[PDB]
Ligand binder design. Structure first.
Ligand SMILES: Nc1nc2c(ncn2[C@@H]2O[C@H](COP(=O)(O)OP(=O)(O)NP(=O)(O)O)[C@@H](O)[C@H]2O)c(=O)[nH]1
Ligand SMILES: [Mg+2]
Length: 169
């Protein structure tokens, strides 16, 4: 009797999809890099006085798992396209992810948020806020900056904001 939303987290290997997801669910930061194939996590939560069930699908960034990722992506109600602000290649691959989502959902637009992660690494940052916002605006999608490292920045907000975007549908 509650709406269920499948929230799919995509992006290049190592950008922090799992760290964001784990902060969201467990409120801890994982320091180890253990590559994901596919994991799903469920919680009941209340956003703006309205309860929902969230199934968060944490996908593989490693390109060897791309066939399986595409299949899991089909089921999505909304997407976080995550890059790392310390990894220029991950930012340049945002287009590939944008194209992919629209293809797998067979639509001209779809609920998604561009997520610029690892902003706590201010001395290693390579992609500017202006660059990120420009990329998001090109696709007419929201833009938000995050850090999964303690103390986390905008983690809960990002997932909640994706739900807000889905609720516009
Ligand atoms: N400083 C900092 N490190 C982060 C952040 N997010 C992730 N990391 C670190 O970056 C590494 C990769 O994170 P991880 O969440 O595994 O990335 P992933 O995108 O899930 N990788 P995969 O696609 O292979 O599953 C880990 O060492 C993790 O601690 C962040 O916001 N800040
Ligand atoms: Mg992962």
């Amino acid at each position: 009797n509650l709406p269920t939303y499948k929230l799919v987290v995509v992006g290049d290997g190592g950008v922090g999809k799992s760290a964001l997801t784990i902060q969201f669910f467990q409120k801890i930061f994982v320091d180890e890099y253990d590559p994901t194939i596919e994991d799903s996590y469920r919680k009941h939560t209340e956003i703006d006085n309205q309860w929902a069930i969230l199934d968060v699908l944490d996908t593989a960034g490693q390109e060897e798992f791309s066939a399986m990722r595409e299949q899991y992506m089909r089921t999505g109600d909304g997407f976080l396209i995550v890059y790392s602000v310390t990894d220029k290649a991950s930012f340049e691959h945002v287009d590939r992810f944008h194209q992919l989502i629209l293809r797998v959902k067979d639509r001209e637009s779809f609920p998604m948020i561009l997520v610029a992660n690892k902003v706590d690494l201010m001395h290693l940052r390579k992609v500017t806020r202006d660059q990120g916002k420009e990329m998001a605006t090109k696709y007419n999608i929201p833009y938000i900056e995050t850090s999964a490292k303690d103390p986390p920045l905008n983690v809960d907000k990002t997932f909640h904001d994706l739900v807000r975007v889905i609720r516009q549908q």
